[PDB]
């Protein structure tokens, strides 16, 4: 049946909550029908989309509007919500119905007179009828029933009002707020909407995220409203929390320019990080004398380490395990060593213990990650005991990333002399508690510590991120070797020194950046933001306004 | 002074909001961001008062 189009004007407002408020002006953000939205009229069973919620209105009676269907592509594979208006009551059921929308025989049976379902048992709700009639022509002539159907989070909500209107083949003028009719806590997915005519017409609109200013009277009811997104005047009324605006100029908002597109630039690095050489080294140093390896001028895939089996722990400090893949770094170090396995928590950046204090200490900030895995095999050989543990340093709290293998005598204070017993000679401890394939602390957890320098210096390690071209002379969202921001990129014409990568202004903020592939210098100019004010003669004079940017 | 305060880093890992957000996940960034918000709000309130 054919469509037609009209305008909502004022319709679609409802009480957003269950709170009594009187003689107040309350600003609320919810799904509402825009005051002047384009409403589609349908002749009176088409299937319409269901978005955030649906506005429905009609003057037809229950012998024409027998209910509604809400759900996803209707089949036995998905639950649908069936709302039927009977002569004496309303019946609402949720189930994997293929049909169940008949109960009215005439001529159309091709897609009807079928009752195939599954284990319904879902919110089989029965109550008073949603559609009430009037005393014929003794009313206002054609009662306009307004409904709002929402599906938000664990709820399907219905708001409505009967409010009889004067006869018209269009939507009426004037203000009326809808009240909650029923609230059904149904976990249903709704993407489509269909009316039940079992075959004059009806109106359908759609709700959008809007902020409305609602005016309540002394009796706690809504008598008016303002749509904040309608025009500059409504915006002014809303910012001033008033339905009346005095002559003058008001500051209501802030102008912004969107970049619409992004730019990603990296140096052409075709090398890959030697991670196999670290994690699959097969030869790991003791914590006493840990092995320090450096990584540079290559691409670092960390996802392959994080999203990987056989690791026991993967703890990142100062960075997320799922973000480091998109960051650029300089001088990445991989400290490779073996510990007893109950010392894993003792190599954290801020913890104490014989390892933290004597064998291997990290900085207090330490941006990086500690990665370790079982690897009980090979290392914990039966009869094999190969893990030097540094215990005696005379002092304590050695130093971040310092390796002390001096093997001096820990004079116990017993005497300022050389010797063995009472002298605690031999700084490392030879009683290695390997406990081959048994107990706890039997030397699981080969450890690799990744230390990163998050410097302004040219990246030496980049993630597997693909670059784009440049746009220039437009507001863009850019990323230059991890340096991000929004602005307009233009030729700087600045004489950068051969070693400089970017420039800064008097405020010490980024002013210009060198492109990693072309080595050209681009200025970064912030996009316009300004501010927005509205000029009005006053609402007691006219509703015409001027806008200043 | 008002501008320079933007680079103060009021106990956060970085004075740059983008560097915090690009590095930390939601539940971690919120903490670092809140530190900057408090410091910047206090700095702005000081400016206005003066």
């Amino acid at each position: 049946l054919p469509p037609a189009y009209t305008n909502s004007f004022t319709r679609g407002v409802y009480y957003p909550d269950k709170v009594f408020r009187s003689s107040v002006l309350h600003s609320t953000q919810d799904l509402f029908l825009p005051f002047f939205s384009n409403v589609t009229w349908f002749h009176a069973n088409p299937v319409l989309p269901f978005n955030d919620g649906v506005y429905f209105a009609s003057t037809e009676k229950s012998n024409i509007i027998r209910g509604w269907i809400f759900g996803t592509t209707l089949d036995s594979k998905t639950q649908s919500l069936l709302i039927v208006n009977n002569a004496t009551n309303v019946v609402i059921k949720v189930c994997e119905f293929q049909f169940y929308h008949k109960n009215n025989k005439s001529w159309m049976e091709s897609e009807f007179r079928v009752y195939s379902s599954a284990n319904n048992c879902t919110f089989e709700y029965v109550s008073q009828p949603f559609l009430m009639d009037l005393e014929g022509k003794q009313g206002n002539f054609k009662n306009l029933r307004e409904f709002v159907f929402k599906n938000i989070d664990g709820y399907f909500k219905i708001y409505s009002k009967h409010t009889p209107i004067n006869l018209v083949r269009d939507l009426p003028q004037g203000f009326s707020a809808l009240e909650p009719l029923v609230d059904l806590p149904i976990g249903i997915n709704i993407t489509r909407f269909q009316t039940l005519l079992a075959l004059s017409g009806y109106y359908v609109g759609y709700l959008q995220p809007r902020t409305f200013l609602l005016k309540y009277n002394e009796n706690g009811t809504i008598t008016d409203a303002v749509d904040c997104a309608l025009d500059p005047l409504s915006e002014t009324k809303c910012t001033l929390k008033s339905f009346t605006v005095e002559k003058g100029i008001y500051q209501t908002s802030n102008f912004r320019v969107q970049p619409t597109e992004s730019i990603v630039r990296f140096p052409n690095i075709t090398n890959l990080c030697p991670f196999g050489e670290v994690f699959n080294a097969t030869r790991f140093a003791s914590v006493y004398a840990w092995n320090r390896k450096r990584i540079s001028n290559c691409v670092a895939d960390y996802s392959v380490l994080y999203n990987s089996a056989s690791f026991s722990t993967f703890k990142c400090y100062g960075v997320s395990p799922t973000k480091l893949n998109d960051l650029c770094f300089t001088n990445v170090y991989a400290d490779s060593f073996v510990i007893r396995g109950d010392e894993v928590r003792q190599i954290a950046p801020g913890q104490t213990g014989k390892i933290a204090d004597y064998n291997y200490k990290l900085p207090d900030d330490f941006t990086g990650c500690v990665i370790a895995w079982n690897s009980n095999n090979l290392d914990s050989k039966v009869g094999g005991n190969y893990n030097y543990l540094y215990r005696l340093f005379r002092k304590s709290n050695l130093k971040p990333f310092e390796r002390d293998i001096s093997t001096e005598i820990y004079q116990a204070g017993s005497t300022p002399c050389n010797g063995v017993k009472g002298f605690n000679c031999y700084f490392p401890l030879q009683p290695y508690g390997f406990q081959p394939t048994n107990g706890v602390g039997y030397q699981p957890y080969r450890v690799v510590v990744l230390s990163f320098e998050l410097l302004h210096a040219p990246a030496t390690v980049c993630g597997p991120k693909k670059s784009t071209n440049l746009v220039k002379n437009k507001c863009v969202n850019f990323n230059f070797n991890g340096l991000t921001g929004t602005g307009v990129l233009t030729e700087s014409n600045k004489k950068f020194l051969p070693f400089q990568q970017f420039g800064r202004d008097i405020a010490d903020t980024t002013d210009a950046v060198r492109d990693p592939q072309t080595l050209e210098i681009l200025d970064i100019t912030p996009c316009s933001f300004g501010g927005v004010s509205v000029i009005t003669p006053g609402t007691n004079t006219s509703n015409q306004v001027a806008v200043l940017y | 002074t008002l501008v320079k305060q933007l680079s103060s880093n009021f106990g956060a890992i970085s004075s740059v909001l983008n560097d915090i957000l690009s590095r930390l996940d939601k539940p971690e960034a919120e903490v670092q961001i809140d530190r900057l918000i408090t410091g910047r709000l206090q700095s702005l309130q000081t400016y206005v008062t003066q």
């Binding site: 405020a507 912030p526 933001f529 | 008002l2 501008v3 933007l6």
Partner: peptide
Amino acid sequence: PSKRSFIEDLLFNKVTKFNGLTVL
């Protein structure tokens, strides 16, 4: 047609890139 008398010119001659900051 910018004057500002001689003395005023002396006064004007003698006396002498944003993030959310504007000047009206």
